[PDB]
Amino acid sequence: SVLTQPPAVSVAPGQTARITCGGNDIGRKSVHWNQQKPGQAPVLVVCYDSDRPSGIPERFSGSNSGNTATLTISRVEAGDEADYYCQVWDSSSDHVIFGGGTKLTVLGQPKANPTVTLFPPSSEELQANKATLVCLISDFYPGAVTVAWKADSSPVKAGVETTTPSKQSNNKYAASSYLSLTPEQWKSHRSYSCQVTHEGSTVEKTVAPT
Amino acid sequence: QVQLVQSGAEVKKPGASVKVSCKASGYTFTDYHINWVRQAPGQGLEWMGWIHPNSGDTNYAQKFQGWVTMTRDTAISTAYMEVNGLKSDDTAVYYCARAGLHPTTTDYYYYGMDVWGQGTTVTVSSASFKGPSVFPLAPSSKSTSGGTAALGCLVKDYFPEPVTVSWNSGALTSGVHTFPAVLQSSGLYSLSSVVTVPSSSLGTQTYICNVNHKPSNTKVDKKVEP
Numbered sequence: 001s002v003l004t005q006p007p008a009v010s011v012a013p014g015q016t017a018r019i020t021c022g023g024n025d026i027g028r029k030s031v032h033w034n035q036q037k038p039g040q041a042p043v044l045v046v047c048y049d050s051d052r053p054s055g056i057p058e059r060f061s062g063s064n065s066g067n068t069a070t071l072t073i074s075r076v077e078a079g080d081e082a083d084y085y086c087q088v089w090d091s092s093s094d095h096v097i098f099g100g101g102t103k104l105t106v107l108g109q110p111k112a113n114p115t116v117t118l119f120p121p122s123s124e125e126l127q128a129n130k131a132t133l134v135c136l137i138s139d140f141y142p143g144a145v146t147v148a149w150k151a152d153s154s155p156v157k158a159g160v161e162t163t164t165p166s167k168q169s170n171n172k173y174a175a176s177s178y179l180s181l182t183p184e185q186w187k188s189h190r191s192y193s194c195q196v197t198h199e200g201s202t203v204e205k206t207v208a209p210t
Numbered sequence: 211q212v213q214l215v216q217s218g219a220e221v222k223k224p225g226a227s228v229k230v231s232c233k234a235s236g237y238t239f240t241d242y243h244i245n246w247v248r249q250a251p252g253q254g255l256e257w258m259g260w261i262h263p264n265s266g267d268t269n270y271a272q273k274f275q276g277w278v279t280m281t282r283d284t285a286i287s288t289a290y291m292e293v294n295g296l297k298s299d300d301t302a303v304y305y306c307a308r309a310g311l312h313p314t315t316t317d318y319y320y321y322g323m324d325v326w327g328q329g330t331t332v333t334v335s336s337a338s339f340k341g342p343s344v345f346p347l348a349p350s351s352k353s354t355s356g357g358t359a360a361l362g363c364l365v366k367d368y369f370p371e372p373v374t375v376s377w378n379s380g381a382l383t384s385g386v387h388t389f390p391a392v393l394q395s396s397g398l399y400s401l402s403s404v405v406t407v408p409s410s411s412l413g414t415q416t417y418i419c420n421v422n423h424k425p426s427n428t429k430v431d432k433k434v435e436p
Contacts, residue, residue: 032311032322034255041326042255047311053324085255089320094269096245096257096323117353117360117404122345125364134347134364134402136389161392161400164252168387176389178400205353 001090005099008144011076012107019102021069021086031069033062034085036101042085046071073104081106105142112172114140114198118205121186131186133179133207135194140165142199143173150193151185211236214244214306214327221333221397222296229292230330232306239287240264243309245323246280246291248302251393260309261289296334298395303329335369335397341428342368344421347404349436354406358385361434362404363419367396368426375403376420382407412436 004022011017021031031049034042044053049064059074073080086099115138121131137145143165149156159180165173177194186192187209195204217231232244246258259270261280268280279292293300311322347362354360365373375388382405391401403419413436421430 028318030314030318030320030322036255041305041328042307043326044311044324047322047324048314087255087322089318089322091318091320093272095271096260098247098255098257101254115353117350119347119350119362119364122348122364125343125345125366128343130366132345132364132366132400134362136362136387136402136404138387161394163390163392166390174387174389176392176402178392178394180394 001088001093001095001097003086003088003097003099005084005086005102007100008103008105010105010107010142013076013078015076017073017076017080017104019071019073019084019104021071021099022067023069023088023097024067026067026069026088027065029064029088031062031064032087033071034087035082036085037082045084076104076106078106078108080104103144105144107142109141109171111199112139112141113201114138114145114196114203116194116196116203116205118194118207120207120209121181121183126183126186129183131181131183133181133192133194135177135179135196135205136174137176137196138168138174139170139172140174140198141172143167144198145173145175146197147175147177148195148197149177149179150195151189152191156192212308212310212325214308214325216304216306216327216330219331219333221335221337224297224334224336226296227292227294228296228332229290230304230332231288231290232327233286233288234308235287237308239282240284243321244280244282244289245307245309247305247307249305249329250299250302255305258291258304263287263289293332296332298334298397301332301334301397303331305329333393333397337369337397339426340367340369340398341423341426342366342373342400342421342430344419344430344432346432346434347402348434349407349409349412351409357409358406359409359412360404360406361417362402363421363432363434364400364402365421365423366400367394367398368400368423369398370425371399373399373401374422375401377403377405378416378418379420382417
């Protein structure tokens with residue numbers, strides 16, 4: 001059994017956020033919902049499809065029917081920004097199942113596009129038998145980005161490490177991504193690219209051994 | 211004040227085992243299952259299983275059965291999760307949670323989770339205390355404003371945090387951007403610091419990043435040339 005959640009939902013403050021949880025015959029099951037704020041442990045915000053525990057504001061409401069359970073957050077505030085998870089028990093497998101999680105972004109300022117800076121490995125690092133490409137990402141809002149690396153025309157997944165976005169002194173976000181290669185890998189391809197996707201648009205920089 | 215008090219962060223070598231604890235207070239330990247859930251960095255919640263402290267009955271998730279062990283000691287109201295044969299993809303926060311949400315019907319006879327512990331971080335790494343290597347990031351103007359250039363320093367493969375970076379012994383602060391470290395699969399950190407400077411200054415002014423990794427007693431003053 002699988003619970004399908006949208007990965008991302010964005011709303012402006014005061015608006016209503018709706019987060020869906022798809023599952024075959026989920027309407028037969030009791031759905032509970034967790035809220036997890038950055039760095040924190042999950043907290044229950046909706047229990048039994050539509051109840052809320054003590055202390056949770058009544059703008060947090062849920063519904064469940066057919067093949068879709070929905071968490072609705074009315075009059076969204078910045079403090080609501082978090083990852084939300086639905087959970088059910090699948091009796092046929094005796095497994096507790098979590099949705100993939102939905103990141104609710106509360107849009108507190110206008111979109112800002114990423115600046116991307118990409119450095120090739122230094123000659124000195126190559127002399128130490130290593131090679132690291134450095135992709136620096138700055139001045140973007142909201143603080144959510146996906147980075148993909150290419151070598152020549154093809155995707156590379158091995159050796160990539162990317163940080164979570166973090167706030168800058170100007171209240172926009174920054175992140176970095178590193179691609180570790182061997183000197184032979186670096187020298188044998190025509191080029192490597194760092195491709196940064198933010199809010200439906202991609203900024204790509206390319207470096208070459210030449 | 212129903213609370214679950216979890217043990218502290220652990221750094222383990224690959225192949226080792228780790229046994230994390232979850233102690234109940236503010237309620238009767240044997241009244242409720244304890245569930246275990248882990249979360250890899252940046253990823254979702256993955257249920258590992260549950261144990262009922264009264265009977266000792268267990269329910270292991272398919273993905274974790276056979277290489278983790280849930281136990282409990284009712285004399286001290288504590289549950290344990292032991293993870294064996296640790297690998298780098300076992301790096302995660304390990305949560306316990308009380309199954310305080312009783313079923314409301316015998317059709318859906320499931321006790322759901324209400325109160326969660328704060329989590330125990332487990333980082334699997336072949337890392338000892340290690341000083342970084344420092345490399346120059348040669349000046350580039352391709353993504354800075356007109357008339358300026360970005361140059362930097364790569365601080366590679368150190369453990370543990372933190373590394374601090376200044377520029378020209380602190381005399382240079384404008385336009386400096388030090389990016390928080392990445393934690394790699396190896397369990398080693400890397401970070402970069404870049405400063406945006408006037409392009410006309412490249413021939414005249416010297417730029418040195420001052421890297422200090424106190425945990426390894428390593429300092430490096432790396433000159434960054436055009």
